[PDB]
Structure formats: structure tokens, C-alpha cells
């Protein structure tokens, strides 16, 4: 009778609820990021469908209310069962929504960590380079260009690091199951980045130390060259007087250059030893010898 038709409606609703449950319990989380995205969309549509079904369950509520009294002992229990069962399906919806989100985040966070790790690696290789220059001008170029790299990477990497660390801080705050692993992941990046910042410091230091040595091995070649100019004095009159005055002024110039070069050379002895020290006081001996002969000739004048 009337109860039979009502049972039919409850049966249809119960079947729909089970059909949704069974589709929502599926264990497939995804492969690539898009697969888990598409599944999160799908399950969102299922959740919206479940919410939309509220009116359909409402129709049962009205029918049961207008039926409840031939035998309502079974009727009340059966409908109340639908009430709690539907509530349970909704909670399970929140569960599987959450686990699909957390799966997606594990997928993306892993992509970013691996990408940043490879990114530090690329920078690290360019920071731990051993090239130091064949000539002073070239080492100067590397020093300036690397300094630019130090600043650009120095600030560039910070944004990426802050993004990954915050992404971890959040996913740990959420309560992600893999949070323990994530913590080490962050510790791995934070130390590695710090080392790069330290490495680029040492490398920059190395370049500076190289520049001064090249500077000495610039002047040694350059100043000794001006020594040959002294030979001009041996062959060489108002015009001659003017040239001689200019020449004497040039000698005054020279004195400052040689004094600055010798003082510069002193630092290398402090910073170098053995073969290198010996080669420094070596070239610092050759130039000084030129100083002695040139000064003696000038004294003769």
C-alpha cells in the first residue's frame, strides 16, 4: 500500500547514496599533478551532487512526515537511518576531499623541492669554479661579473627559498601525514642554500686575492717597460731644455708608481709562501734592479 510506495522511494534514495559512496571510496589518487587535479574536480562534482540531493531527501522527509501511523516503528527507524547515513556520507566527502588535496600537495611540493635542489646545484657548480684569470684585465672582468652573479643569485634564491619553506610550514600546520619527511626536506634546502651563500663568499674572496697578485704581475711587466724609456736619456738648446723639464716631471711621476708597487708587493709576501713568495720577491727584485740602474744614470746627469 502507501507504505510499499514509500519503501520504494527510500530504496531508490539508499541506492543513490550507496552509488555515491562506492564512487567516492575509490583508491586512485593520481599520477601526474593533473591526474590528481582532475580527480579533485570529479570529486568536487560528486560533493556538489550530494549537496544538491538535499532536496530529494527532503521529499522523503515530507512523505514520511505525512505518513507518520499504520506501522511507523519501522518507518521512523528507516528514515532516521537515511538521515545519519547521509550525514556520514557527507563527512566521508570531507575526508576524501582532504586526502586528494594532501596527495596533490605532496606531488607539487616534491616537484618544487627537486627543482630547487637542481637549481642550487647549477648555481653551486658556477660558484665553486676554479678559474681565476690569465691576465689582470680578464680577472677583473670575472671579479665584476661574478659579483653581479653573487648579488643576482643572492637575492633571487631567497624568494624561492622563502616560498618553499612557507609551503612546508603550512603543509605541516595542516597536519599532513608526510609532515615528518617534509621537515627534513626543508632542513636539507636551508642548509644547502646557506652553504652556497658561504661558497660564493669564498669564491668572491678568491677572486679578490687573485686580482692583487695580477696587479703586481701587471706593473712588473708594465713598469719594467717604462725602464726602457730611460735609454732615451743617453742620446738626449731651448727645445731640449723643455723636453728635459718634461722628462724630469716624468721621473717624478715614476717615483710614486714604483713606491706604490713596492708597497703593494709587500702584502703578497704576507699572503704567499715558497715558490710563489720567491717568484714575487723575484719580479720585485728585477724591477728594483731597473730602478737602481735608471737612478744611477739619472744621477750621472
Amino acid at each position: 500500500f502507501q507504505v510499499e510506495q514509500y519503501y520504494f522511494d527510500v530504496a531508490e534514495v539508499e541506492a543513490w547514496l550507496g552509488e555515491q559512496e562506492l564512487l567516492m571510496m575509490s583508491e586512485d589518487k593520481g599520477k601526474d599533478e593533473q591526474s590528481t587535479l582532475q580527480l579533485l574536480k570529479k570529486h568536487l562534482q560528486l560533493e556538489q551532487g550530494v549537496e544538491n540531493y538535499e532536496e530529494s531527501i527532503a521529499q522523503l522527509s515530507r512523505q514520511c512526515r505525512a505518513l507518520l501511523h499504520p506501522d511507523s516503528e519501522q518507518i521512523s527507524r528507516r528514515q532516521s537511518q537515511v538521515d545519519r547515513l547521509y550525514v556520514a556520507l557527507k563527512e566521508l566527502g570531507e575526508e576524501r576531499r582532504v586526502s586528494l588535496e594532501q596527495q596533490y600537495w605532496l606531488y607539487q611540493l616534491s616537484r618544487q623541492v627537486d627543482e630547487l635542489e637542481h637549481w642550487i646545484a647549477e648555481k653551486e657548480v658556477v660558484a665553486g669554479s676554479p678559474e681565476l684569470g690569465q691576465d689582470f684585465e680578464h680577472v677583473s672582468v670575472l671579479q665584476e661579473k661574478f659579483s653581479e652573479f653573487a648579488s643576482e643569485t643572492g637575492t633571487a634564491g631567497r624568494e624561492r627559498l622563502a616560498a618553499v619553506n612557507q609551503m612546508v610550514d603550512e603543509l605541516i600546520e595542516c597536519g599532513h601525514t608526510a609532515a615528518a619527511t617534509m621537515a627534513e626536506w626543508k632542513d636539507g634546502l636551508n642548509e644547502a642554500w646557506a652553504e652556497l651563500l658561504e661558497l660564493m663568499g669564498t669564491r668572491a674572496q678568491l677572486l679578490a686575492a687573485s686580482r692583487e697578485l695580477h696587479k703586481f704581475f701587471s706593473d712588473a711587466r708594465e713598469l719594467q717597460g717604462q725602464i726602457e724609456e730611460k735609454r732615451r736619456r743617453l742620446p738626449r738648446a731651448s727645445s731640449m731644455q723643455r723636453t728635459l723639464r718634461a722628462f724630469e716631471h716624468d721621473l717624478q711621476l715614476l717615483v710614486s708608481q714604483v713606491r706604490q708597487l713596492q708597497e703593494g708587493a709587500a702584502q703578497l709576501r704576507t699572503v704567499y709562501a715558497g715558490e710563489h713568495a720567491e717568484a714575487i720577491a723575484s719580479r720585485e727584485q728585477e724591477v728594483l734592479q731597473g730602478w737602481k740602474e735608471l737612478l744611477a744614470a739619472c744621477e750621472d746627469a
Binding site: 610550514d169 605541516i172 661558497l199 669564498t202 687573485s210 699572503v271 713568495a277
Partner: protein, 453 residues
């Protein structure tokens, strides 16, 4: 003194993994791990170079039974670095040296696949000279053994270093002529090499590991009494003549002899050779001869038939390498009645885990360094104003390995709300029912106040 900074005087600084040095000389301590320090002297470096000294956390150095690393592998560079004078590298370690029972050895690998012992040839005068003009101070040997700091002196650099805990070994070259090789730890332990037992000259070594009655008596009681374990390091080698071993008897037929001829990393297997080999008792010691270099051991067990099993019961335990580690306990309160509790046993591990700080966990207890034994399990129980959930089921435990993580998750509920929520946490080697035997460490605690989130 009020003297202008020279700017040509050693550099005092700290580093993470690498730093810059010049012939000026430098002292580079490390912030990450206390006691890690590099001391390059002045004028002992040819040119400005980037030095590296990072703990690798390559191929593991071969280790026989009874040996384990004292510290994580040390990586230093440049790999081919050469210095005019010796330089100092100091690494902290965790191996429990047990007085003079154990010692440390240093290994080095140039390429990372082959390891060789590291020995340095220098003058007694050089040791004072090594500091040169530096103002640094060097800790005395006892003050180094106390801080568990190992000091490697090296005149060149290799790709890797390793500090390895082992049983004290006495080594001395011996050739055809003959020789004697006695023990420092146990003077009565001794080995004699007759005239013509070896062809070439080899550096023979001898270990003696004495017994501790607490462990032996605990595992066997009065069932048997042992002597030290005497080991001849060039194992699996037949001698062209017979060696004469001397070993003091086990303090109490009734006396059996056990020997293990295994070599390399193979776990040892004990057999009894009392019948085959004659035993001579002089001055409370036993002297026998042997044509092979093996392990040896004496037993005064009443049950001769089971004697070998008794050795296996003891050996299995006492080979485990002893590490001095810290116990740290973290906790968060689920509510006032209950709480969550994470426990760790650490050596080189992070002083303060980031995860616990992020999850708002709190350090509630922290033991001084204590001897735990590598590879053996740990039992945890709480005995004070709170207790840990358990039932008619298996307990919870964690295993200690060195330089791995050692975590034990726990849940604890306050037993009674009458008094403050303080407790007692004990880590043991065996579950607590009889007389309780010394635990591994004891930490008291006090559950932190509930956080509302």
C-alpha cells in the same frame, strides 16, 4: 694589548663546510658541530685556497666485527692539498673509549674507494712548532679524551678521513729473527714468535678485550667465567713455526679453550680446541702454541658440552660497539589528562628538531651523554605520576644505530590528577618480575600546559 689590527695575522672565524685561507694562517671553528676545528699555521700554506671540511651524512671503510665509526666521515679539500708544515684537524666523536679498553684509529681515502691507515711522520720539536705564531691553545691529551675530540695531524690532504672505534691493538714489526708482542691493557696476555716463523717482515697486531662481570654475570650468572678475548690481527694466516700465546686464566678439567679462525667481516664462529692443543698453566696463566692467527678465548664453564653456546651468548652482545649518546624527550598535550610524547636517542643528530618546533612540541627532558650499544634495542617505560598506554600486548621500543635517527612515538596519560604531572622515563636494555637491573638512562619530566588550537 692596544695594537692596531695587523691585517697580516691569523684569521679567527667559523665556517659551515668551506672557507678561504691564505699563508697568513687561520683557525676555523665550526658552528654546526662543537669541537670541529681546522688550524692551518702561518706560512704553511703556499697560496690562498678554498678549504673544505664537511661531514658526509663514499664507500664505507672495511670494518671487522667489534669496530664502528666514531664520527661521520670527514671530507676535506682540495683533495691533493700539500702544505709545507703539518696542519691540525679536530673532529668530535661518540665512541665510548671505556678507559683504555678501546682506542681510535684514523683512515683516509684519496679517491673514496680505498682506505689506508693514516700515520704522520713529524718531529717532537714540530709539535710545539706546529702552533708557530698562533695564539690558539691546544687541549692536553686527557682533556681531549674527556671532550671526545680526536685530533688528526696531517701534512697533506686526502679526499676523506674516518675515525674508527676499535679494541686497543698493540702492533710491532716482526720478521724471521723472532719477536714478542705483549698486551698493554692486560700485561699477562702475550704472544711469542719463534725464530723463523715468518718470511717477510709484517706489522703484527694484538687486541685484548677484557670481560665485565656485570654483562657476563647478567647473561649467564655463575654458569661460566671467561678470560679476555685475545686477537691476532693478521687472521687467516698460517705460520711456518708455532706462536706461543699466554692468557691469564678466568677468575672464578673445568677449563676449555675456544678459537675463531674467521677473517674479514665474516661473523665469528667459535669452536673448542682444548683436546687438540696442549695447555700449560704457569703463574695463573695458560700458555699454548698455535700455527694460525685467529681469535682466542678461555672459559671456565662447568657444562663443557654447552661451552661454545655460552661464548656465543656472550660474544653476540659484547662485540656491540659502545657509543656515548644523548636522550631527548619532546611532548605536546592532547588535553590535560593525556598527551603525546616523542623520544629520541641522538649522536650527531640535530640539537633541536625543526618538526617539533613547527608542531609546537616542547623539550621536556635531556640526558647527559650515556653509553648505549650499537644495534641493540631499547625499552622505554614511565613510572611516575603518569603512565604510557599499553595492554596485554607487545610493548614499544626503538633500536639504536649510530648517526641514524632513533625515534619512539608514545602516548601517555596522567595516572592521577591529585598532584603535579611530573614523571619518570627509563630506557633499559631488557624489559622490567624480579630485581630491576640498571637502565640505560633515566629522565624526569613535567608535561607542558595545554595549548588551545
Amino acid at each position: 694589548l692596544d695594537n692596531v689590527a695587523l691585517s697580516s695575522s691569523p684569521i679567527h672565524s667559523g665556517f659551515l663546510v668551506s672557507f678561504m685561507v691564505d699563508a697568513r694562517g687561520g683557525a676555523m671553528r665550526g658552528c654546526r658541530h662543537n669541537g670541529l676545528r681546522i688550524i692551518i699555521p702561518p706560512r704553511k700554506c703556499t697560496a690562498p685556497t678554498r678549504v673544505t671540511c664537511r661531514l658526509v651524512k663514499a664507500t664505507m671503510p672495511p670494518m671487522v666485527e667489534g669496530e664502528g665509526l666514531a664520527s661521520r666521515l670527514i671530507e676535506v679539500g682540495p683533495s691533493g692539498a700539500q702544505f709545507l708544515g703539518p696542519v691540525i684537524v679536530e673532529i668530535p666523536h661518540f665512541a665510548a673509549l671505556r678507559g683504555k679498553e678501546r682506542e681510535l684509529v684514523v683512515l683516509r681515502s684519496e679517491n673514496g674507494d680505498s682506505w689506508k691507515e693514516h700515520f704522520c711522520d713529524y718531529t717532537e720539536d714540530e709539535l710545539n712548532e706546529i702552533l708557530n705564531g698562533m695564539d690558539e691553545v691546544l687541549d692536553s691529551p686527557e682533556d681531549l679524551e674527556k671532550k671526545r675530540i680526536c685530533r688528526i695531524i696531517t701534512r697533506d690532504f686526502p679526499q676523506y678521513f674516518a675515525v674508527v672505534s676499535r679494541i686497543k691493538q698493540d702492533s710491532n714489526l716482526i720478521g724471521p729473527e723472532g719477536g714478542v708482542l705483549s698486551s698493554t691493557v692486560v700485561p699477562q696476555v702475550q704472544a711469542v714468535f719463534p725464530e723463523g716463523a715468518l718470511t717477510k717482515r709484517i706489522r703484527v697486531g694484538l687486541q685484548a678485550q677484557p670481560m665485565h662481570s656485570e654483562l657476563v654475570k647478567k647473561i649467564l650468572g655463575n654458569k661460566a667465567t671467561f678470560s679476555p678475548i685475545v686477537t691476532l690481527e693478521p687472521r687467516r694466516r698460517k705460520f711456518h713455526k708455532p706462536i706461543t700465546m699466554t692468557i691469564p686464566v678466568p677468575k672464578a678439567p673445568t677449563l676449555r679453550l675456544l678459537c675463531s679462525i674467521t677473517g674479514g667481516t665474516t661473523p665469528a664462529q667459535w669452536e673448542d680446541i682444548t683436546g687438540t692443543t696442549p695447555l700449560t698453566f704457569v703463574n695463573e696463566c695458560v700458555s699454548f702454541t698455535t700455527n694460525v692467527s685467529a681469535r682466542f678465548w678461555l672459559i671456565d664453564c662447568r657444562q663443557i658440552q654447552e661451552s661454545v653456546t655460552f661464548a656465543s651468548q656472550v660474544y653476540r652482545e659484547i662485540i656491540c660497539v659502545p657509543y656515548m649518546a644523548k636522550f631527548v624527550v619532546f611532548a605536546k598535550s592532547h588535553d590535560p589528562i593525556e598527551a603525546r610524547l616523542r623520544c629520541f636517542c641522538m649522536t650527531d643528530d640535530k640539537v633541536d628538531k625543526t618538526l617539533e618546533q613547527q608542531e609546537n612540541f616542547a623539550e621536556v627532558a635531556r640526558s647527559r651523554d650515556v653509553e648505549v650499544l650499537e644495534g641493540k634495542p631499547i625499552y622505554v617505560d614511565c613510572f611516575g605520576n603518569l603512565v604510557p598506554l599499553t595492554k596485554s600486548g607487545q610493548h614499544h621500543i626503538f633500536s639504536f644505530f649510530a648517526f641514524k635517527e632513533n625515534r619512539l612515538p608514545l602516548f601517555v596519560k596522567v595516572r592521577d590528577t591529585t598532584q603535579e604531572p611530573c614523571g619518570r622515563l627509563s630506557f633499559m636494555k631488557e624489559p622490567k618480575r624480579g630485581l630491576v637491573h640498571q637502565a640505560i638512562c633515566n629522565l624526569n619530566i613535567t608535561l607542558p600546559i595545554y595549548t588551545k588550537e
